[PDB]
Amino acid sequence: QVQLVETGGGLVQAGGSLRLSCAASGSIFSINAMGWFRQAPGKEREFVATINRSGGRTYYADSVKGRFTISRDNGKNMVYLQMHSLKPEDTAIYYCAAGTGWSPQTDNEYNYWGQGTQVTVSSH
Amino acid sequence: SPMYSIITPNILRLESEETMVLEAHDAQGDVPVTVTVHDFPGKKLVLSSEKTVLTPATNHMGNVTFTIPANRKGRNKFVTVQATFGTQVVEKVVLVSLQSGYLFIQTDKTIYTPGSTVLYRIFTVNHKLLPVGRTVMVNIENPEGIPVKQDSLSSQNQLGVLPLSWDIPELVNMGQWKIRAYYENSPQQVFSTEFEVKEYVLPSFEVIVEPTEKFYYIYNEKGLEVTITARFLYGKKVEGTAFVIFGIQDGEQRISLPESLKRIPIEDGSGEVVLSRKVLLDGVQNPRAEDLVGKSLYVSATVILHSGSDMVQAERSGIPIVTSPYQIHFTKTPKYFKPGMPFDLMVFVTNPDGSPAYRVPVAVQGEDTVQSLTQGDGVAKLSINTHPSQKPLSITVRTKKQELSEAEQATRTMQALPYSTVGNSNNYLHLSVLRTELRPGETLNVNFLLRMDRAHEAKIRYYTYLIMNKGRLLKAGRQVREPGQDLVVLPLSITTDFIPSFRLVAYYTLIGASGQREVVADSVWVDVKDSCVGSLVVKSGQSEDRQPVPGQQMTLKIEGDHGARVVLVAVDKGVFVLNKKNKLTQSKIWDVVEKADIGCTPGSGKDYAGVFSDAGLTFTSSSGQQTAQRAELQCPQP
Amino acid sequence: EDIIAEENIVSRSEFPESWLWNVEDLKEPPKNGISTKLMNIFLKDSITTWEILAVSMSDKKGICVADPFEVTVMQDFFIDLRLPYSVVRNEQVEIRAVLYNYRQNQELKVRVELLHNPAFCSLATTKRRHQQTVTIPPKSSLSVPYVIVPLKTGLQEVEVKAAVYHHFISDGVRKSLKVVPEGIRMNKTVAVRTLDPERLGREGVQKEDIPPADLSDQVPDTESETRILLQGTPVAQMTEDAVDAERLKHLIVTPSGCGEENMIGMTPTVIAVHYLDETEQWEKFGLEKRQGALELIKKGYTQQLAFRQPSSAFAAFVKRAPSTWLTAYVVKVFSLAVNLIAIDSQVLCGAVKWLILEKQKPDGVFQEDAPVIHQEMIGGLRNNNEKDMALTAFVLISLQEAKDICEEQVNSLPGSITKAGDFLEANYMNLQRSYTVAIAGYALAQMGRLKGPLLNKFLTTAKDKNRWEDPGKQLYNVEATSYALLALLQLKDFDFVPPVVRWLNEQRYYGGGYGSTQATFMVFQALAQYQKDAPDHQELNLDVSLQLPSRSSKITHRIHWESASLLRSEETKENEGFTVTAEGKGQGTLSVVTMYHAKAKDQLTCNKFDLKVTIKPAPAKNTMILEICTRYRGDQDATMSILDISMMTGFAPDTDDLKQLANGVDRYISKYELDKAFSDRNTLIIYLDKVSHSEDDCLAFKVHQYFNVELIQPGAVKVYAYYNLEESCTRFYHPEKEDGKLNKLCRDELCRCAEENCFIQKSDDKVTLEERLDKACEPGVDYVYKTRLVKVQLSNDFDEYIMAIEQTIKSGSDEVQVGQQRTFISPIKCREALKLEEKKHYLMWGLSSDFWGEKPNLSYIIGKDTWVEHWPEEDECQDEENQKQCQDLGAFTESMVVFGCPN
Ligand SMILES: *[C@@H]1O[C@H](CO)[C@@H](O)[C@H](O)[C@H]1NC(C)=O
Ligand SMILES: *[C@@H]1O[C@H](CO)[C@@H](O)[C@H](O)[C@H]1NC(C)=O
């Protein structure tokens, strides 16, 4: 199997930026879907971004559609999520997850999840 | 007076270690024995010369192991086996087969295109199936019989495995090609396998043509019901259309029935189709229905996917037309009995396709009380009591299946002849043993019963038993008898060296009625459960809750004997959809061993000489007691 | 727009039928006698079930064949590229890429693309992709037809990629087929030369130069394989059969009596064992009887030593005078007895030592004192006129049977032999008895010399050239011919032997009886030596080595009489003249056959059915009527047959028409196909209960264009009977294309694709003078011409535009002069695009790759890199619209003609 470790989180300001790095246990190659998910306090776990196996296809949620950019390095076994132009509604625990490629915008086809990282975007 | 006896197998083999047991009956002191093996009709060459001494500590019981060297038209060859006990010479002319062992040929596939490569291995074993180092000649010939590639390999230090290859040229003949192999030392024993050369692509699915019963009852009004099963090679059901046509086969003439042609749909991977009884009878020119009994039926199905992108033909042949779903065979029962002693029938019951039938009750007709049941090997044991009389014993055995009517029951009759004794002394020897599936690790209790006159039973103080496995002497020993012990039990350890079966022949000897030297013998054939001598299992070495994906790494687990060389091949199962013939299996290896067995009868003989010869042994003594000469390599044909 | 095949699909290509041909050794330490080896394998790209078979071999356990272990490899979405085994070159076929969707309740939308290959002619070109979007329902499949034409022979490759919309799932399959030329396989015999080095050739060797393959029907640029068959021809000679051992059962005699009577009983038992050991008739006589007669021979030798005198001589009693004959006859029997039983050799050599000291005059004469009490054993020596010469011959033969055994013991034996041979040669030409010439004909042929006249007298005294006969008892003549047979087998002559043995067998003399001692002993010593040394064959031993300039080695074969390599084939794919050197004895045959591709009629297609497929636009966007008429080519109606109908891309059949067709009496459309949706239905099978051989059976149904597409691939219809897919017939249909075939241009079984663009699509106003010079000064632009269109020969396959070369602006590789004509070829789809008018002028340039025919009849092809621009006339330039073009074209000519192209 394969497990994941999320880093890159922490405390940031309202209008700033930060990128989250996802480290993979085994070889991330031949894994079709690589997705990021978040869960705000008091809310449900929602979809953020998926990337293709080769990186040529992505999908984003409408709330973060022009603001986030997902990338991956199959040689380094790494997934990234560059978060630009932050909002106070983006404060959530960000989860990195391994998928099968089928229905990549839903969590039902992700069998290997990570620990998660806290990304707090304060209004101050 | 002392009698010196020698026992060798009926047939000797080249480069094979044969055993010769030497006995000195009714003698005191040491007996020096010089065993020599010469040629025939000459005596110039000395093929083997071993020496031994029969001491009275071993009760004058010893063996000598020799090996006929393979220095060598269309006729038999013989050797002079000669053992000189002190100054008395006891000699016997023995038939020799020109066999160095066995060769088994495996090809990677059963079918090949022009332009592809035939990967093939040749396994060089002897008569004990153990690997040997010999020179092997290999030929590959076309359907015209012209050898297109010839090799000559040395399997020495190769662990009896000769890997080989050949590239099929593009300009080449289609049909059945052969790979033929023989030992250099025994070029008269040729081993062959076939592979088809054809232009094809691998299909995407397989078709199974399975009738509801593996025969056709001639009085079944429902006709021959056949299920057509099609599914993809990766294990998914096929949607399509099937073209099924039937036919009848009398020997090697096939007569198609064009009225039986049905086009059925294949829904959810399955379809059903019936050859009716009227269409069968009308197609074979309306005879009496009993004339079809003994002929077989074949079914041919052609399944086409609804897309039309792929299609598969499949055939099920050899569906016999029977009046009874069972056949009774006495091929495992002795054809000779001892009068006054019980006679053990080995009723073998088969299905009409030759497979053994399980839990089929059989009974001797006229006995009624005696009734047994067939085990997993298809064999049922029936011990019946015989009168102490020289009459022939006619035995008819019938099945007693509950669901079957009496017309549909099977029957067969055999006759057993009385064992002729020396001088009509009525001195017999009976070997009795229970018949169930024997496996290695078990102990076999062999009962040695003595029916003879009480005025001479104190002279018999030992029996001499011999164990014949794969046409060789595996173990020969002594069973000590005390005076008054009419029955002694020999606990025999059944190891893996007894696979696939063995014979146990025993004898006693004495000077009895008129001062005449009398030898009394008996033999029994014991079947053990067929397996490998060792073991070999291939399975998955991972968890495999996942189904594997193209290109995925997979861990393969191989379990087997220590120091064994394992050779592998992985074949697309779509190859076997096109051709599944000439595949190497372990059951085919045990077919080759049992056909090469120099024993011909599952029990005793007409006299003591018949007991040894039917078990594949010679007997020769200084008192004139000897077996008849065997000059034919094959067994007598019934 | 988004190309979904941007997934960077690396297509699946490893589809072996068999793999894992590996050898593993179980060296791991055993646990309860079982060693477990873990083995990491990489599965191949195939989506199938693999059957893995292991066989083990063990020093202590033997051979074990494991039960087969299966591994199924699958995906939820994958392509199955159903490729045939072979395709004929330039023949249009329809392959099927089947796309499988094993999702449970998800309907897939897939973009599937056939990749371009220059070895094929398809709708996929170098500048245009053959992409389409299909819908696959869950737990279903969809067949995507692709129409291709292979253009070059050999192993060519077909790749199909696919990627699903809204899921990150992709797949590609890259398989290969063989492209075989249009001919039929045929074999021809190159040479049949009989090898005989002792009859043909010189100095013992025979060189045979083989010509190369003399084919003249071969398809150009195809492989031929030459098969060399060296095969030895075995020859046999006739030999006379041995005497049946059932007639010889009376020769086993228990020897008894005194010193002469014991040898009478010992004689037929020693000679029967000696004859039956040589002929090996003990199997048909009784193998058990051999040892009993062997003890009677020992009983004969034991009781004969009781009458051996202490002077190493032999007499009938111990008080009887010794004999010269009887001592020589014990030497004759005991010497032949040594080969089966021996005890003492000094008895044999002691009798030879006495035979020279006492009974050898220096004349060489053996004289008999006659104490032979039995005149029966004497044989032909009794009642002989020349009894002096016949006895000298008898004792001399006895000395030679014991010469090889008593060479060191009796050193004076070659002295008496030479003296006895000297006496025989002097009075050989004076004998008048056939017995004396026979026994002294063997006595002088044994290790010695008979002169030319002496051999002539030995052969001419054979009356009827087969027997030696004299007045007297016939046992003397049977003994004499037995001596004359041993003479002819000692001289190794075999032209006089067969009438001699035939007479001995026709005598039917089986030995035994009164006075039969010489006659039984000699007739089975001679007939044993005939079976010992006999020409069964003519000794085949050919050393044939072949020197081929196709390789750097010479392959030899020793064709013995041994049956290991009676024939040996040597394949050589190189077709070159080679040398066969053959030396040795015997005869052999050489066969050289070359297989090749013979160009015949390409009529293997549609050999069992006529098939006519018409598509007519007879009146939701477009609606055409697809009509299929078929007829079987047999004497009777065909049985159940299959119509494999393929839709042209964007079309689907009318559902109400198929339900009416399925209701037919002799037709069946399955319920699966009728319940399909209107879209994603591009294949269809109509089953036929029969198809007539007398008339065309015709069906027709409407097809509707549910999706507009820029390029319509032709549909296909395929007919076959159920029992034979190979005997099929495929016709293609497409509106605006001839018989549904894709546009190609062919000449002498070489086609190039014509699905490319018509010409360079740059507008006449968007091009400048500098743009014309920069394009035309490229090195790829071979010719630049000003032309005038003379005639437009319209045809249905392609339009031919005959151009007169008005000006050679840049001369290419075609030396064309002004006023000459060249034909410009373009497919009929470009007739409306080119808009070429007769007597109009044009500026034309193109590549040298657009040349077509040979240099005397060179045609030009108007391809995608051919520039075709209208050149207005000189009076037409007075308009203001043509001012820009005429200023460019007149400057384009003056810049290229006067100054050329720099760099
Ligand atoms: C032959 O003798 C050896 C040694 O005594 C023994 O191990 C073996 O079992 C004997 N074989 C037979 C066939 O008696
Ligand atoms: C030669 O051609 C004939 C005709 O098809 C065929 O039967 C035969 O097998 C061929 N022989 C060889 C050596 O190709």
Author numbering:
A (entry chain C): 5 to 128
B (entry chain A): 23 to 94, 100 to 665
C (entry chain B): 753 to 1371, 1380 to 1663
Sentences copied from the publication:
The proteolytic fragment C3b of complement component C3, is the pivot point of the complement system and provides a scaffold for the assembly of the alternative pathway C3 convertase that greatly amplifies the initial complement activation. We previously showed that the nanobody hC3Nb1 is a strong inhibitor of the AP. In this study, we expand our toolbox of complement targeting nanobodies with the development of a new version of hC3Nb1, called EWE (due to the N-terminal addition of the sequence Glu-Trp-Glu), that specifically binds C3 degradation fragments and inhibits the AP. The three pathways converge at the cleavage of complement component C3, which results in covalent deposition of the cleavage product C3b on the activating surface.
In contrast to the complex formed with C3, the N-terminus of hC3Nb1 is solvent accessible when bound to C3b. This structural difference led us to hypothesize that extension of the N-terminus might obstruct the binding of hC3Nb1 to native C3, without compromising C3b binding. Hence, we added a Glu-Trp-Glu motif in the N-terminus of hC3Nb1 since this region protrudes toward negatively charged side chains in native C3. This modified hC3Nb1 nanobody is referred to as EWE. To obtain insight into the conformation of the N-terminus of EWE, we co-crystallized EWE with C3b and collected X-ray diffraction data extending to 2.8 Å resolution. As expected, the overall structure of the EWE:C3b complex closely resembled the structure of the hC3Nb1:C3b complex. The first residue that could be modelled was Gln4, which corresponds to the N-terminal glutamine of hC3Nb1. Our SEC and BLI data indicate that insertion of the ‘EWE’-motif at the N-terminal renders the nanobody incapable of binding C3, whereas it does not affect the binding of C3b. In in vitro cleavage assays, we showed that EWE inhibited the cleavage of C3b by FI.
